[PDB]
From Swiss-Prot, chains A, B:
Lineage: Eukaryota, Metazoa, Chordata, Craniata, Vertebrata
Main location: membrane
Disulfide bonds: 213-238, 222-635, 225-229, 447-452
Topology in membrane: Multi-pass membrane protein
Impact noted for substituting residue 467 to E: Reduced anion permeability and increased cation permeability
Gene of this entry: Ano1
Residue runs in coiled coils: none
Protein name: Anoctamin-1
Effect of residue 511 to A: Decreased threshold for activation by calcium
Effect caused by changing residue 515 to A: Increased permeability to chloride ions
């Protein structure tokens, strides 16, 4: 139980005589405006503040805000500056705490650096009543828990107006945006599953997968290892071919075009939605620059340079930042190197001959992801440290700049293994004549049997699927870190902002639009993550957290630029994934230039290249030839080269240049047309809606001609 | 001589009784506000209007505008709504005519459709005094002629403030923008001439031009005609090789990168410049939509549909518009076809044997350009007609939409021959085994001897150089169409807007940034056109034209979007001009893959392909073999194919695929990096300047704290 107050205060009861000395200076300044009262309880005492009327419209008229009017045309109230209710119970606790907090910022000797100084420990508004409990008299928070934050009701809409009224415009703006994201993922997921099912239908009626799964060929490949690997049948490893056609379907290209156009129309939908929201709440964009106090070490260094009586050191630490990005890349690839080398060439010790080499990939990805998740906090801390060194101007500039520097780091270490696997995997190894040795002592890396697409898909799928669960489970074992009202809310967690909360969503959006070329069904997994995530966040904002202060923002700001950036980067990278990785272009080239008939047959016989086994470099031979055939005289590998019985052997063939030319041509055409379409749907859909335009115009007319009297 | 009036009126003295009947209705409405007086003179009488004071600040306070204040902080006067001069001679004739014109628009029974109706013939403000003349008492127009509009003083700066004060914000905005364009062309031209001179230096020290100009080879090419052409020496046509190296220099690539970055920094410079101009004149962007009356056939069709008691027919005529664009393309190429066929295979008749075939190209381009310039007015008239059929909403929407539809047409017919020559010229012809016949009766077109770059350069150079002169000279032979003050100004030309005046500048900007890949030195020619053009336009606005009405705009609007569009389109098209046309990539491929040494030699011996002359299709042989050599057994052509003594003959060789792959790879890399750099310099340079920001902030502070008293 309490009376009707606004903002709390947590002092620390017992240098320290300076803490208690200066501690009473601030409330003497607070006698002038607010009516404060304090109390004594169990362990450490607290200070209380209550607003009185005759200064509250003084501060409410200090700034221009809108409140509901007296008149109402066409079944809806209108808004104006400050008049025509007169109840003395119409100021919401959100608004009351907002005004009180503005008085807290305005006077100083600010309370922010005073709070971080050590004299005060916390400064937070309280909430009315309690979530759930017994016999509460219709709490608003209880209503919000009963309608929004429970797992039982997930499929019903966001009650966005109530959450705006109770938590403020920023939090409500976040949940509104995530609502729009999850709502836009529905047709993306449905079309995703349609494309995957069309992949499932045409499995047993294609040419390449039959020709790989066929018996009676006795065709043998080159050993793909240095020492301890033998020759192997094409018909042996044929599951990966079946799933390969399940993923590189000629409908998946259509799905990629659909996804780029989907990202663009998502941007349009959200611009339109925040436009109508900024109608419904506040539209006056004349927010005062320089109003808030500056970041205090700029004042401290201004005292230093003021004693001395630079714009170069920031550029120097920007170069330091780029250095950090580069070794973030190469350290990422090093970590993938170690993870692939979790268990290499271990066949000599057990002699049990399992040699399945499938779960090895799974351990590589899992151990890999543990290293990413552990490294991520480190990169965040380096970001805060470096940005702290930079000494920016204000609070807003500090938050913006820190946001950017955090995002680059999480982008890099979160997407570098997928870039390594999708592109640079099995390209740089030579012919069986001469292998490319790294560290000048052993071979680089061979591809997966039948294509390096499977590692991409099962690696991608459990990052996007399981990153959250591995993060939540492992994060706690790692040591990461009649009752009175303020004593309840003191024991809650503090509030830290929304940047660690937006960040995961932007990266997830990356996993959607950056790799749906080789792997469809991705918006499905993002949706299944998303439904659980939104309600988990709601339960976090109600249960485990104290109230925020509700600073009134008008748009999310930087995150829209980051989304537009990722959504524009998507196109070129999907072009390279379709052309290079997906093995789609050699099928079309073989269907148009080397057909020998109408349709394709012997595509696999076209790709392979017939090495002569007598030409290894004295020790790169297989150790024990397995002799599945009686003997073996020639092995085959897939690199488009000429057979050895021609006068030139092992050189770069004609077909390599032909297929390379076709691949690059597809990159040009795809990138240009999809840039044009994505710019087109930007141009077509109006950023402003009609209803808001004519509705604010009608409101302006009725306000003026009702106002002149 | 006159007294001090503002706006004239031209009636038509003698159905007609309705003209004189309704003609007196408007001045009876004008008795209420303005003091009008009329006169009688020579041929057809006129009506005069003079403003009086006590209604003039009524209308000046009807709208918010800024006028100079009384106070001045830091050596500069400030501005505010309307107060604190009080002279009754401080309203400029521009402003007085502006207010009078607003009263002319506001009351109706509008004067615009009344003017186009037939009752009134003209309605124009007059000017003070006269340009030049004898013993004038310091005319402002005389000052402007003496300082700005004369050819004698061209190199001195634009007096932009005076022209804003005397002609208004729109005209001054035009001349300001063109000033920025011409000023930005200086370093572009200097770097252009540096690149051309670097081309001039390295002529006699290269490999390919020596190898073409060399004697002692006796190498012969295939005849390049159907019947009446013989075999020819490579050393014969060697001027075109020399100039070819003069144009496809490996420094010209650097110049192309410089030009894309130049276009982007031009956009930044002009955004910044109109920002400071909109500081100096008017910054309140809250201009009233729907204030002006609507376009009258929308009211007429609203009367029709109002009797009946569509949004599809506009889409249908948009499809009609796209049809018009397509046959504008193909008609353009047809016209080039005719112009190339101005004199074809005429060698049979004279038997004089000149056969120079150089001036033939010149006649093709000249006749071509006559056809473009004659066709251009037709396309303009179709644009006005079609847009008239569309029936838009307002005047502003009509001007915008007509602007767009005019620009597409002039873009298409102005750039289609250069697109045909640069790309599609000599690509589609086959090998000497089988030629590609168009119309199924005769051959398509061969390339120019030694490269199709010369036709591009000499065709481009005289369009951009001579289009203006041919337009001005031919345009007049084609029949294209004590004295009192208003009788002087009646005999002047009317005013038609700025769209035919912006249009030539945007197309010229196209000729700069769209084809500096194969042809440097282009900003030089644009500069030489430009200096003459700006002063010719100034002399036009002073001498041959009556005054405009000075509608206050705040930016050029649509033309900035068109400039950004062209400047963004420049990159991809420069990539294709460098890669495909410019013959730069085969030099690099030969320098890296078929070197046989360090540097290049025998590049020409590498390119040619050795056809066997015994394999023509019974009549495609040369008619009379010229027999410059005793006999001839093999001819050579440049198409990357295999010699006939191999088991495969005349097929597509390896080198064709290799060079094609290299070309497309260059297109990808160039387009992406130059998009990134052009986006980068957009991001770096601040769109807002510092001085304007802090200066308007200081003005706001001083205005408020000076205002509270």
């Amino acid at each position: 139980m309490d009376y009707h107050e606004d903002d709390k205060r947590f002092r620390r009861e017992e240098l320290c005589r300076e803490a208690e000395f200066l501690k009473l200076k601030m409330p003497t300044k607070k006698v002038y405006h607010i009516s404060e009262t304090r109390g004594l309880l169990k362990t450490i005492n607290s200070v209380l503040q209550k607003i009185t009327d005759p200064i509250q419209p003084k501060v409410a008229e200090h700034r221009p805000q809108t409140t509901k009017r007296l008149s109402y045309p066409f079944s809806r109230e209108k808004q104006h500056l400050f008049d025509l209710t007169d109840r003395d119970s119409f100021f919401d606790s959100k608004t009351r705490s907002t005004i009180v907090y503005e008085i807290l910022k305005r006077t100083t000797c600010g309370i922010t650096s005073l709070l971080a100084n050590g004299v005060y420990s916390a400064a937070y508004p309280l909430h009315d009543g309690d979530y759930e409990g017994d016999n509460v008299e219709f709490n608003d928070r209880k209503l919000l828990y009963e309608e929004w934050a429970s797992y039982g009701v997930f499929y019903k809409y966001q009650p966005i107006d109530l959450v705006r009224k109770y938590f403020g415009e920023k939090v409500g703006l976040y949940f509104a945006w995530l609502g729009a994201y999850t709502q836009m993922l529905i047709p993306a997921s449905i079309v995703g599953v349609i494309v995957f099912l069309y992949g499932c239908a045409t499995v047993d009626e294609n040419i390449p997968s039959m020709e790989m799964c066929d018996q009676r060929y006795n065709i043998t490949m080159c050993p793909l290892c240095d020492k301890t690997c033998s020759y192997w049948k094409m018909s042996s490893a044929c599951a990966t071919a079946r799933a390969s056609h399940l993923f590189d379907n000629p409908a998946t290209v259509f799905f990629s075009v659909f996804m780029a156009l989907w990202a663009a129309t998502f941007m349009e939908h959200w611009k339109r939605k925040q436009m109508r929201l900024n109608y419904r709440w506040d539209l006056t964009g004349f927010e005062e620059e320089e109003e808030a106090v500056k970041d205090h070490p700029r004042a401290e260094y201004e005292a230093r340079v003021l004693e001395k009586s630079p714009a170069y050191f920031t550029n120097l630490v920007s170069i330091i930042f780029m250095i950090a990005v580069t070794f973030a890349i190469v350290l990422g690839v090093i970590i993938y190197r170690i993870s692939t080398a979790a268990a290499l060439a271990m066949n000599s010790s057990p002699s049990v001959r399992s040699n399945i080499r499938v779960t090895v990939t799974a351990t590589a990805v899992i151990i890999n992801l543990v290293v990413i998740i552990l490294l991520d906090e480190v990169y965040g801390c380096i970001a805060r440290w470096l940005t702290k060194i930079e000494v920016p101007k204000t609070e807003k500039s500090f938050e913006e700049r820190l946001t950017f520097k955090a995002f680059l780091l999480k982008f890099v270490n979160s997407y570098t293994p997928i870039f390594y696997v999708a592109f640079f995997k099995g390209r740089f190894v030579g012919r069986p004549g001469d292998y490319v040795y790294i560290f000048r002592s052993f071979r680089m890396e061979e591809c997966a049997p039948g294509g390096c697409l499977m590692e991409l898909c099962i690696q991608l799928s459990i990052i996007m699927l399981g990153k959250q669960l591995i993060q939540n489970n492992l994060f706690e074992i790692g040591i990461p870190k009649r009752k009175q009202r303020y004593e309840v809310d003191f024991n809650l967690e503090p509030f830290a902002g929304l940047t660690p909360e937006y960040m995961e969503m932007i990266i997830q959006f990356g996993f959607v639009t950056l790799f749906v070329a080789s792997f469809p069904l991705a918006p499905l997994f993002a949706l299944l993550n998303n439904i659980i995530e939104i309600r988990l966040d709601a339960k976090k904002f109600v249960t485990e957290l104290r109230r925020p202060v509700a600073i009134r923002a008008k748009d999310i700001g930087i995150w829209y630029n980051i989304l537009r950036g990722v959504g524009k980067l998507a196109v070129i990278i999907n072009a390279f994934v379709i052309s290079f990785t997906s093995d789609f272009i050699p099928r079309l080239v073989y269907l148009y230039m080397y057909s020998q008939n109408g349709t394709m047959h012997g595509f696999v016989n076209h790709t392979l290249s017939s090495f002569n086994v007598s030409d290894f470099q004295n020790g790169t031979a297989p150790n024990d030839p397995l002799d599945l055939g009686y003997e073996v005289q020639i092995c085959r590998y897939k690199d488009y080269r000429e057979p050895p019985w021609s006068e030139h052997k092992y050189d770069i063939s004609k077909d390599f240049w032909a297929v390379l030319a076709a691949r690059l041509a597809f990159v040009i055409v795809f990138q240009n047309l999809v840039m044009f379409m994505s710019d087109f749907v930007d141009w077509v859909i109006p950023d402003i809606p009609k209803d808001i335009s004519q509705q604010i115009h009608k409101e302006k007319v009725l306000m003026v001609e009702l106002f002149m009297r």
